[PDB]
Symmetry: D2
Subunit: 122 residues, 4 copies
């Protein structure tokens, strides 16, 4: 699935996700959010199962973005956990955790949860 | 915090997390779970905010492990979203998402959620 | 929104959710899952904000189902946290947590996470 | 476990959770948060598995609080999904989802995730 994951992806919020899969299971690329305190590109890095079960199952994968680059620092980070589903309508369906730096007093409200779907089009 | 994150960490389940922080905000290392379908070490990769707010806030960070190495393939992946808290009792408090490859029929039950705390001792 | 929430709802998995809103903010009804270890109806109970912000915001709400009734006991429970969005395309968008009874050894893998969308049609 | 769940519980944040279990599997009571936009008591309602597996497994359960009462309205709701563990150190370990009413534009950032542990003491 190294081939199928590599490329440009778009989510329901209009975010852009550009990624390269390594044969060992590495994922490198950049992310650009369409929402929130973000601006231009951010590095992403991750892992994917480089030998998925041959039974029509998705390919598990994950990545992280620290929301710091040359333009802004949102003092936060998001990780995406999900699976790549290939074929004629190729999808990466994910749930994500966004954590932001907080004082220990405010740690209870430090983590947002949500879900994104990525397609090759739009 | 590049200095404080780098090193060996242990969580409440007895898992071992060895990590190196880059100055640009990179996190590389290996993970060894004490539970589940895992055996020996797995690559991890991630991002961390390399310039945290000076106000006593934690440092946001995240990483991913694809549960595939030379011994086993659990066809799954876990991402950790959380923050590093330094000082005399240094902690990485996280929530994690574990996704496993599934058929689209079973995608509703593909994702486990939980939380880990890492300390330098134990 | 007491009026708009009350009624029969359907989610993307084909599940059926029948609910009555009280004026005090109570939610009572029954749930029938289309997937998993479930069969016929299960009681649900919950709360909703009975005075939402007049600014075009959704109405926060939640409910719980213990997966035990006269036919089966899945020894689990699911809670839905989300918001009701009214108008011509009325939606309840939720994320859900499904916890199952486990031994303390297996507690790390006790909780599934996912998301459901409910509409009045389909 | 109807007996063991009923009573007053306290979490790591210093919140107070007073609950009555019905024999059918109902949970009614009040919640008082020690943090956030809350003040005095809020109704809670929920479900619990009223016949847990005899194998040393926890008892699955869940509840909801809409953050509206006579004093304040936070336009939000939280659901707790978890299990009751009895014995000499009785615990309700939960993960929780807090959703707040938002505009559809801001729905991506509407949901906080976290975890609470409740004990009978402190
Ligand atoms: Ir979806
Ligand atoms: Ir904790
Ligand atoms: Ir959705
Ligand atoms: Ir805990």
């Amino acid at each position: 699935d190294e081939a199928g994951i590599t490329g440009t992806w778009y989510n329901q919020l209009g975010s852009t996700f550009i990624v390269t899969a390594g044969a060992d299971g590495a994922l490198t690329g950049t992310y650009e959010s369409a929402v929130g305190n973000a601006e231009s590109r951010y590095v992403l890095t991750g892992r994917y199962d480089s030998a998925p079960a041959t039974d029509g199952s998705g390919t598990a994968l994950g990545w992280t973005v620290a929301w710091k680059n040359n333009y802004r620092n949102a003092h936060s980070a998001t990780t995406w956990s999900g699976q790549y589903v290939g074929g004629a309508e190729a999808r990466i369906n994910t749930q994500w955790l966004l954590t932001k730096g907080t004082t220990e007093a405010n740690a209870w409200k430090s983590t947002l949860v949500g879900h994104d779907t990525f397609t090759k089009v739009k």
